[PDB]
Write a protein that binds this ligand. Structure first.
Ligand SMILES: [Cl-]
Lengths: 243, 241, 240, 231, 235, 244, 195, 250, 111
């Protein structure tokens, strides 16, 4: 054996064990989700409060790319930031040459090809993050989830991290109960509920909720963080459902 | 035994990394099939969407490389999309440099040459994919050309790829033994698609709904993929006969 | 470019590639340098498992770096050519910019620096060579003898030997060389050098090379007969 | 074990051992403390000597007039990273006539450390940093780990026995956060914090190092007889 | 094998730690700082009696106000000295002044960690950098291949270091004269040296504000050796 | 990274030898024997082809003996492909010297440079050495007739008579026995063929398993001629000395 | 710079080179030696652009001396001249060409013959019985066409050279402050002190 | 990133072997049999077209390739390696010869260039050797007809006739009995077909056999007229029909 | 053709006493026959009790002052907050200016 000691080496199965090992780093991370809605997308993430000394609201994890795309990830946080920095470079050069802001599917493949490139050589390490991201373009709303291997798909709902299975089950109920569609304001509330429900798998430390959204009607197609009254309203909705 | 980790020869003259890349090909558990008509080339592939949370419209292994060339991939999607982007770029450059559309077989050779390099150069791994290129070439007519991680490529009368490829291959062989010709003797592409689905059903022994399949069709001057309703229309026609 | 760090530290603080380069020097043919009151003599062993040699054209063991400085060595022959070439180029470059030939110390310091650079550069192995560098500074009559080694360290010697069985000939020189009274003449210095090689060599035939460097670019290589006379004279005094 | 030869290798449970070993160098380092109010931010550092004949290794470095850090671990790595911060602060001033936000300073350090954890040949930085500053949104304290993780805090501590000071600050949180417009009291709280990490040794005059930045105070370091006030 | 810039599980760089072992094999070098000057002394340690000891150069001038002693793989020091001299002279060219001893030391220590897969390995030599400047007066620095430098009142490096350092711990006080320091270096060198100390196998030097950096003659050191033996017999 | 798969071709053994050079010499010891003999009025080059097949085209073939310029030739022992790389470099080097100085290159200068290239592959670059040993036979107006040999280490030496490749130990003893200084070319031709005939691993030495060449001043007045022997000429010279 | 002459006779090559170094309206020096010894039996004189001349001469000198030490052998005058030509032929298509004209006087010890080569800054080489660079040639070539014989002695060559210097001192516009004369023969290079 | 493999992947073992070259020759041994026979007025090169599937069109896969109008190549071993070698070989005939001398290279020199490319894959950083042996047949004005074998090492040998691959040992012995120095091109084609039948197992016809010749100039294959000195390619690929015609009088 | 230089006019003046020094300059900034600003200062406090003016082409003047101010900042960072003496500042400014010897700062500098 020794097939797992080097990146880009195929095992006799046809697997790249180093990527599968990066997936273990993702599974170890905190829970993050994405909900696609009528005219946009909603992102939410669990922020474990390690200590009282952490300043609330001041260790922001959701990141914006361009002015219309939001990105959140679970796993090695620095790796996620590297991916977003690239995403921003990719989006800037697209807008430079083509004038129009980068479409979400186009942006999804830019990240995909870049992450896939880090599975081609033994001189680089795969990314230790699964990234949920999306936004609104000329063809409406799109939600994506990208994994260490470079694999990504479009999603109605997406989840990753330590509470992914709990969150997935909760996402599937929403898809079944709302075939016509979920509204942006509803999806924000649901996102809060699901992060609280997915927190059961990480319940030693209590946490801080962080939500963002893009909606054609509610945010004018731009990425905005959910703060203040709308955030507290979403927190309360979640608190009522766990009891 | 580091001769199994990089693309150097083993004592018996083999390249294990190339061999293991072939095994990665079936990792998706999807079977694909390509046939030729008089006027067209039809490629079909299974579409398995296990997760209910997936957007089914974004799950695809068929790619539109150029206006005339289509490509279906057997293998993991990251390597599949890697191959697709390169193929698109190569076909675009060819047209700019040489003043005419890149033929299906030339693109196949070029992608096969790139694959060969990864089998010889150490720092680059092979892609765990098998690429099936389809078109109606303006010189050669309906064309199917297929590439693998070894860098091998060849033209086909028809072909199949995937875990249950051998069953589909012999099924097609037996038909062409019977028909005595190199193609499907049919006027419309609609019935060549129907033939493709019919013979996949027989070989695999499974029934398909409109969402269990994925169909690409190449005609003169365009390659296009079918919608769920285009396939449903096609499934109804088979059932009513 | 090939980058690998080949010369690295081991847990005990040794650089094995440098130390193994010293083993290559230990394998090489013996070389000795002895400086007198008014001269330096470089003596060199030549192994006799090679008969049918052509001594006219075969690379000589002692090389002129400039008209006033010479360099002998022990170790890998191919390696030594690279050091000699670089030294000869620096010799001409020094004359060009300073308008004065190199001092023996300076030339030695340069050669040692090259050797050191090959012990902490990526992609290269150290030189399997130690050198004896002898001569006279411009407008100076004081004899100079220096030694370098693969690590890059260099130093001045009244008399020194390198190569195989060099520990035996160093032993001889340590009791037979008086610091208070160095070989007063050319004859005395050549004899002491030949004597020291005869402790290790075998036959004093075509096994010993002797080169004498005197002040003001006065360098000459002795022929077989000239050396053989020293061999003959030493043996007759020995039977006593 | 078999997966700690370099930073480019993941372990089967998804760990980066070279990064973890770099983290270990910080744990061996001498204790340093960081804490802030709404008006000032304060660093306190215990300095370490080789023996009684040697000087005491300096732990605190100035980055700009409004920013600076303290170090625990490999000091040369802190010199590289502090120099990078000095340039980034400087670029912001020369090009935009803008003082670099302490938050951006953190994001920049995160991304510089990260690149050293994903490529062959390199190594992670072997030092932890506590960055304090005062910018357009008031006082700040950051904790830098060479894994890339940067965290904004009211107070913290890194180094050997840092857990004592970190527990103390966690208890004292409600008190020291409201020490506004009083430098000497915020320092006293930090000096009391670092005292919870001492064993057999006590704070002397050439042992203690204190830094402060705030609303009407440039980043300034105190050593020698200037810290005698606080012992 | 393994990367050159690899960390051990205890959080230390293998290659830096191993180079520290090479320095322990080196010949002893001692430095003592006083308010009248800094003294630098070294054990020459000739490998053979035929080697002309005055060609052994382990104490070296960097500038008129800065001197340097070495221990370990001394061939590794040449480029460090070359850099130091250039740094010192370059600063004088750019600023029309003497460069601070600490700034010099920091510049030399910047080279140290510039190895990996830059040079192929760390330096196998430790330096004692002694000098004077107007701001901080007489200073002694110990520069390691780790990139770290400590200021010292007194410091020994090399094979006899841990024994000599313990001796320096007892003997040093803040009122030592230059003459007292000279004798102290000789005394401690004679203790830790293998062969018997004399003017040929040990070398002294000092840096003073007035006369700058000076390596002593063998005649001058011989009299200090004689003065030392007489004083130890005198009680 | 890629460190895992690095053979480290340019390192020392604990004994102070270069692994790859030693192993390349071991490779060369299985190659067909080549002999050079220097006489007072010319030089002989004789080499044995590696086990021949009857369907091999013998006349349009070159394996052992190559021409560097009009005054210098080489006998090869080792990998042919490696040797041709070095031969083309040598050929270019000779033309560079001629272009610079308007004089044909002195033999030793060419030999030194080719040997210096080999040396480089043993000290830096991480590449395998050239698995080749040369016998150089040439003439210039300084030293007249000269024989040299170089090997993968980049070390070269001068000879009156020398062998490379297989059975050098036995071949050298035989040459050392019958060689004398006043020897003529035609005597050297005979010695060369007699030595190969006794050291060969084949049943009997025939024309189709030999390459042969002479460098004489046997042109017309004070000038040197290279003669690469044709198949029929080797057949004749083999009969003339009574080997067949 | 300005005046450099060369005459090849039976057994030697004689080079005469002007002693003046003029910049603007000032003769800065009247004892300048516009020559370098490349090897024991090869001498090169030079004239042209300020700085370029000596820089080139010394660069060639270093290369020939390097060759001598490497091979323990002296290059023939023909070989040295070809090396120098190629350096100038390279130079002329450089970003900044060497503006230097040279004469190379040598004694070939293998042939036992004197040899004189004239090479200009373009790299134009010719072997000649007598040579000159610059405006000097306009007077000396015709003079030497008349008085030169191929079998002359060194003494006859010096008298023939006196005749050239006299003509140049009579008809040339500038004061070139006389010449330094050097002889290249079987015994090497020596300087005539009283000219 | 970037190719960090700047070191040799083929190195000498203690016994003196070059492992990767040996193993490449092993790959050639597994390869399908190909052969070449030199006649007085031409050369024939032949091989079996091993079909991967009956649905595959074996006409689209050419094992025998034109390099220049007067030079052709065939191989045994790894197809993909051969394909790229043909691309490189065709280009080098132009870049390092035709663009300099205005004419095509003689066989021995083109062969020499291919051999160089294969030698470099044996010594350069981060590459394995090519897993093929080539048989190159060609004609040029001053050397006439010639046939060369190029091995993974980069070594090349001129042959009167030879075979490489699967059943080369038996095929070479067969050729030794049949070859003489008076063979006419048609006699060599006949012997080529006989020798190949021994190593072929399944179908033996013009669709399963690939065969080309280097013979007379073909003015009909030139594509233009008007230049007397240009007379057409000597390389010609025999058609499926042309092979079957000769298999009846076998 | 683009001319990268301009002339912003104005004049400056420096006088040194026994225990003081003055550096004066007018505040007018011009191009051609137009006034750009009646109050645009060009004499600056650069720290360490050094005042500096670079008069001529204002874009070069500002660039130089900006670079020297920055040089003072880094001198502190690199040499333990040591004060930059006026003689050392002068030598540093020589190198700033001569660094652009073949594309000069079009200014007369006084400190
Ligand atoms: Cl290609």
């Amino acid at each position: 054996t020794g097939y797992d000691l080097s990146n880009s080496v195929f095992s006799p199965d046809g697997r790249n064990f180093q990527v599968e090992y990066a997936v273990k780093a993702v599974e170890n991370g905190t829970t993050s989700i994405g909900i696609k809605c009528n005219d946009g997308v909603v992102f939410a993430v669990e922020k474990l409060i390690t200590s009282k000394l952490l300043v609330p609201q001041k260790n922001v994890k959701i990141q914006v790319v361009d002015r219309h795309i939001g990105c959140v990830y679970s796993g090695l946080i620095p790796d996620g930031r590297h991916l977003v920095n690239r995403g921003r470079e990719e989006a800037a050069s697209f807008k430079k040459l083509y004038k129009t802001p980068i479409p979400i599917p186009a942006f999804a493949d830019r990240l995909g090809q870049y992450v896939q490139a880090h599975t081609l050589y033994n001189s680089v390490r795969p990314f230790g993050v699964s990234t949920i991201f999306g936004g609104v373009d000329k063809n409406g709303a799109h939600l994506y989830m990208l994994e260490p291997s470079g694999s990504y798909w479009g999603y109605k709902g997406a989840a990753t991290g330590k509470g992914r299975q709990s969150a997935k089950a909760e996402l599937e109920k929403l898809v079944d109960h709302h075939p016509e569609g979920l509204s942006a304001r509803e999806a924000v509330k649901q996102a809060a509920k699901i992060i609280y429900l997915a927190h059961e798998d990480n319940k030693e430390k209590d946490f801080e909720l962080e939500i963002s959204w893009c909606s054609l009607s509610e945010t004018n197609g731009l990425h905005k963080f959910v703060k203040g009254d709308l955030l507290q309203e979403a927190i309360d909705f979640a608190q009522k459902e766990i009891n | 035994g580091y001769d199994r980790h990089i693309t150097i020869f083993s004592p018996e003259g083999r390249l294990y990394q190339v061999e293991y890349a072939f095994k990665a090909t079936n990792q998706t558990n999807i079977n694909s099939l390509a046939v030729r008509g008089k006027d067209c080339t039809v490629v079909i592939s299974q579409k398995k969407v296990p997760d209910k949370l997936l957007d089914p419209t974004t799950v695809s292994y068929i790619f539109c490389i150029s206006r005339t060339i289509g490509m279906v991939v057997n293998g993991p999607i990251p390597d599949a999309r890697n191959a697709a982007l390169r193929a698109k770029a190569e076909a675009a450059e060819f047209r700019y440099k040489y003043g005419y559309d890149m033929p299906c077989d030339v693109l196949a050779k070029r992608m096969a040459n790139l694959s060969q390099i990864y089998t010889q150069r150490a720092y680059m791994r092979p892609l765990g994919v098998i690429l099936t290129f389809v078109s109606v070439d303006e010189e050669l007519g309906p064309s199917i050309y297929k590439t693998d991680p070894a860098g091998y490529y060849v033209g086909y009368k028809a072909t199949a790829t995937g875990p249950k490829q051998q069953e589909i291959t012999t099924n097609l062989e037996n038909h062409f033994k019977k028909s005595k010709i190199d193609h499907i003797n049919e006027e419309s592409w609609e019935k060549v698609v129907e033939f493709a689905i019919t013979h996949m059903i027989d070989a695999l022994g499974t029934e398909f709904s409109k969402n269990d399949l994925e169909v690409g069709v190449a005609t003169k001057d365009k390659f296009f993929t079918l919608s769920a309703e285009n396939i449903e229309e096609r499934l109804v026609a088979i059932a009513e006969q | 470019g090939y980058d690998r760090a080949l010369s690295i530290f081991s847990p005990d603080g040794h650089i094995f590639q440098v130390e193994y380069a010293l083993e290559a020097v230990k394998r090489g043919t013996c070389a000795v340098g002895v400086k007198g009151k008014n001269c330096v003599v470089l003596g060199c062993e030549r192994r006799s498992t090679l008969k049918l040699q052509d001594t006219r054209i075969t690379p000589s063991k002692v090389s002129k770096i400039d008209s006033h400085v010479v360099l002998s060595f022990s170790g890998l022959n191919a390696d030594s050519r690279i050091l000699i070439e670089k030294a000869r180029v620096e010799a001409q470059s020094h004359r060009l910019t300073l308008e004065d030939p190199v001092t023996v110390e300076y030339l030695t310091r340069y050669v040692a620096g090259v050797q050191q650079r090959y012990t902490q550069s990526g992609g290269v192995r150290p030189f399997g060579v130690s050198t004896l560098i002898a001569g006279f500074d411009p407008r100076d009559d004081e004899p100079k003898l220096y030694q370098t080694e693969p690590s890059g360290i260099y130093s001045s010697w009244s008399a020194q030997t390198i190569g195989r069985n060099s520990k035996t000939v160093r032993e001889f020189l340590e009791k037979n060389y008086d610091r208070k009274e160095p070989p007063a003449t050319v004859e005395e210095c050549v004899k002491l050098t030949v004597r020291s090689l005869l402790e290790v060599v075998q036959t004093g035939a075509k096994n010993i090379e002797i080169t004498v460097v005197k002040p003001d670019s006065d360098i000459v290589a002795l022929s077989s007969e000239e050396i053989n006379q020293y061999v003959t004279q030493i043996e007759q005094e020995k039977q006593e | 074990n078999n997966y700690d030869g370099d930073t480019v290798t993941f372990s089967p449970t998804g760990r980066l051992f070279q990064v973890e070993y770099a983290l270990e160098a910080i744990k061996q380092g001498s204790v340093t403390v960081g804490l802030r109010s709404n008006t000032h931010a304060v660093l306190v550092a215990l300095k370490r000597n080789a023996d009684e004949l040697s000087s005491y290794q300096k732990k605190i470095i100035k980055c700009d007039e409004h920013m600076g850090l303290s170090l625990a671990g490999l000091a040369p790595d802190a010199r590289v990273l502090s120099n990078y911060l000095r340039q980034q602060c400087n670029y912001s001033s020369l090009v935009f006539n803008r003082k670099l936000a302490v938050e951006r300073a953190g994001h920049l350090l995160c991304d510089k450390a990260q690149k050293n954890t994903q490529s062959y040949g390199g190594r992670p930085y072997g030092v932890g940093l506590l960055i304090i500053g005062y910018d357009k949104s008031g006082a700040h304290l950051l904790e830098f780990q060479p894994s890339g993780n940067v965290t904004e805090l009211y107070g913290t501590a890194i180094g050997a026995r840092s857990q004592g000071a970190k527990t103390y600050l966690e208890r004292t949180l409600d008190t020291f956060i409201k020490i506004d417009g009083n430098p000497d009291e915020l320092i006293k709280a930090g000096v009391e914090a670092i005292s919870q990490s001492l064993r057999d040794e006590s704070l002397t005059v050439d042992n203690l190092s204190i830094a402060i930045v705030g609303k009407d105070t440039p980043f300034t370091i105190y050593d020698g007889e200037a810290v005698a006030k606080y012992i | 094998d393994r990367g050159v810039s690899t960390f051990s599980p205890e959080g230390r760089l293998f290659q830096v730690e191993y180079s520290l072992e090479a320095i322990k094999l080196g010949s002893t070098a001692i430095g003592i700082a006083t308010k009248e000057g800094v003294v630098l002394g070294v054990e020459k340690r000739a490998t053979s009696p035929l080697l002309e000891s005055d060609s052994i150069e382990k104490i070296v001038e960097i500038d008129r106000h800065i001197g340097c002693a070495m221990s370990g793989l001394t061939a590794d020091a040449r480029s460090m000295i070359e850099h130091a001299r250039t740094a010192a002279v370059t600063h004088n060219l750019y600023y029309d002044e003497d460069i601070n001893v600490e700034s010099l030391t920091q510049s030399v220590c910047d080279l140290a960690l510039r190895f990996g897969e830059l040079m192929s390995r760390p330096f196998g030599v430790a330096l004692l950098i002694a000098g004077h400047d107007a701001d901080d007066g007489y200073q002694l620095f110990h520069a390691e291949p780790s990139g770290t430098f400590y200021r010292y009142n007194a410091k020994a490096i090399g094979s006899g270091s841990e024994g000599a350092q313990a001796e320096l711990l007892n003997e040093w006080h803040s009122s030592l004269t230059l003459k007292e320091a000279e004798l102290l270096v000789l005394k401690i060198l004679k203790q830790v040296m293998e062969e018997k100390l004399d003017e040929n196998n040990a070398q002294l030097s000092c840096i003073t504000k007035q006369d700058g950096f000076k390596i002593y003659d063998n005649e001058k050191t011989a009299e200090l050796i004689k003065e030392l033996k007489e004083k130890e017999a005198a009680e | 990274g890629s460190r895992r798969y690095d053979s480290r071709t340019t390192i020392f053994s604990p004994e102070g030898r270069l692994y790859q050079v030693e192993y390349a010499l071991e490779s060369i010891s299985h190659a067909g024997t080549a002999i050079g003999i220097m006489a007072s009025d010319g030089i002989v080059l004789a080499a044995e082809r590696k086990v021949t097949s009857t369907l091999l085209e013998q006349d349009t073939s070159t394996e052992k003996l190559y021409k560097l310029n009009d005054k210098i030739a080489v006998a090869v022992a080792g990998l042919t492909a490696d040797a041709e790389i070095l031969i083309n470099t040598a050929r270019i080097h000779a033309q560079n010297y001629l272009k610079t100085y308007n004089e044909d290159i002195p033999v030793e200068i060419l030999v030194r440079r080719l040997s210096d290239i080999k040396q480089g592959y043993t000290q830096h670059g991480g590449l395998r050495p050239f698995g080749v040993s040369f016998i150089y036979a040439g003439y210039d107006d300084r030293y007249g007739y000269q024989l040299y040999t170089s090997n993968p280490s980049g070390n070269y030496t001068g000879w009156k008579a020398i062998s490379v490749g297989a059975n050098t130990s036995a071949a050298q003893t035989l040459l050392q026995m019958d060689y004398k200084d006043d020897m003529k070319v035609d005597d050297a031709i005979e010695l060369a063929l007699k030595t190969l005939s006794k050291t060969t691993d084949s049943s009997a030495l025939t024309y189709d398993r030999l390459e042969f060449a002479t460098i004489r001043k046997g042109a017309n007045d004070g000038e040197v001629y290279q003669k690469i022997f044709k198949p029929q000429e080797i057949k004749d010279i083999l009969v003339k000395t009574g080997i067949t | 710079m300005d005046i450099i002459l060369g005459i090849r006779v039976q057994d030697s090559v004689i080079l005469a080179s002007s002693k003046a170094v003029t910049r603007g309206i000032s003769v800065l020096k009247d004892s300048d030696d516009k020559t370098r010894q490349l090897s024991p039996h090869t001498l090169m004189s030079f004239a042209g652009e300020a700085g370029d001349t000596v820089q080139f001469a010394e660069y060639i000198q270093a290369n020939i001396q390097l060759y001598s030490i490497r091979e323990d052998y002296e290059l023939s005058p023909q070989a040295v001249s070809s090396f120098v030509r190629q350096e100038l032929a390279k130079s002329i298509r450089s970003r900044r060409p060497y503006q230097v004209n040279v004469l190379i006087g040598g004694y070939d010890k293998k042939k036992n013959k004197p040899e004189l080569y004239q090479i200009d800054y373009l790299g134009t080489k010719v072997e000649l019985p007598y040579g000159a660079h610059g405006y000097s040639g306009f007077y000396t070539f015709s003079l030497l066409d008349h008085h030169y014989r191929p079998d002359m002695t060194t003494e006859e060559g010096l008298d023939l050279l006196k005749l050239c210097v006299q003509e140049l001192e009579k008809r040339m516009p500038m004061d070139f402050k006389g010449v330094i004369v050097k002889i290249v023969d079987k015994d090497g290079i020596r300087q005539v002190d009283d000219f | 990133m970037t190719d960090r493999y700047s070191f040799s992947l083929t190195t000498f073992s203690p016994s003196g072997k070059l492992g990767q070259i040996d193993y490449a020759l092993t790959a050639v041994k597994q390869g399908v049999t190909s052969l070449g026979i030199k006649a007085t007025n031409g050369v024939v090169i032949a091989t079996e077209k091993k079909s991967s599937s009956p649905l595959a069109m074996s006409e689209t896969l050419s094992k025998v390739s034109l390099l220049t109008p007067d030079i052709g190549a065939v191989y045994s071993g790894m197809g993909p390696d051969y394909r790229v070698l043909v691309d490189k070989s065709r280009k080098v005939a132009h870049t390092s010869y035709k663009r300099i001398y205005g004419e095509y290279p003689p066989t021995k020199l083109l062969v020499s260039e291919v051999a160089k490319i294969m030698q470099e894959a044996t010594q350069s950083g981060g590459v394995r050797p090519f897993g093929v042996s080539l048989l190159i047949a060609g004609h040029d004005e001053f050397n006439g007809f010639s046939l060369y074998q190029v091995d993974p090492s980069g070594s090349y040998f001129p042959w009167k006739a030879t075979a490489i691959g699967k059943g080369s040992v038996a095929a070479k012995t067969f050729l030794e009995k049949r070859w003489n120095d008076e063979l006419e091109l048609e006699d060599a084609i006949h012997i080529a077909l006989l020798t190949l039948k021994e190593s072929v197992e399944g179908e033996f016809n013009g669709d399963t056999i690939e065969l080309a010749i280097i013979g007379d100039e073909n003015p009909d294959l030139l594509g233009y007229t008007g230049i007397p000195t240009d007379k057409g390619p000597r390389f010609r690929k025999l058609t499926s029909q042309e092979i079957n015609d000769r298999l009846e009088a076998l | 053709q683009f001319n990268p230089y301009g002339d912003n006019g104005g004049t400056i003046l420096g006088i040194a006493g026994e225990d003081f020094a003055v550096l004066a300059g007018d505040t007018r900034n011009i191009t051609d026959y137009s006034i750009n600003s009646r109050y645009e200062p060009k004499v600056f406090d650069c720290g360490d009790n050094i005042v500096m003016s670079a008069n001529g082409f204002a874009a070069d003047g500002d660039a130089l002052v900006k670079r020297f101010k920055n040089s003072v900042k880094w001198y502190h960072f690199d040499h333990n907050d040591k004060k930059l003496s006026i003689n050392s500042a002068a030598r540093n400014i020589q190198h700033l200016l001569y660094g652009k010897r073949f594309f000069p700062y079009y200014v007369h500098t006084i400190i």
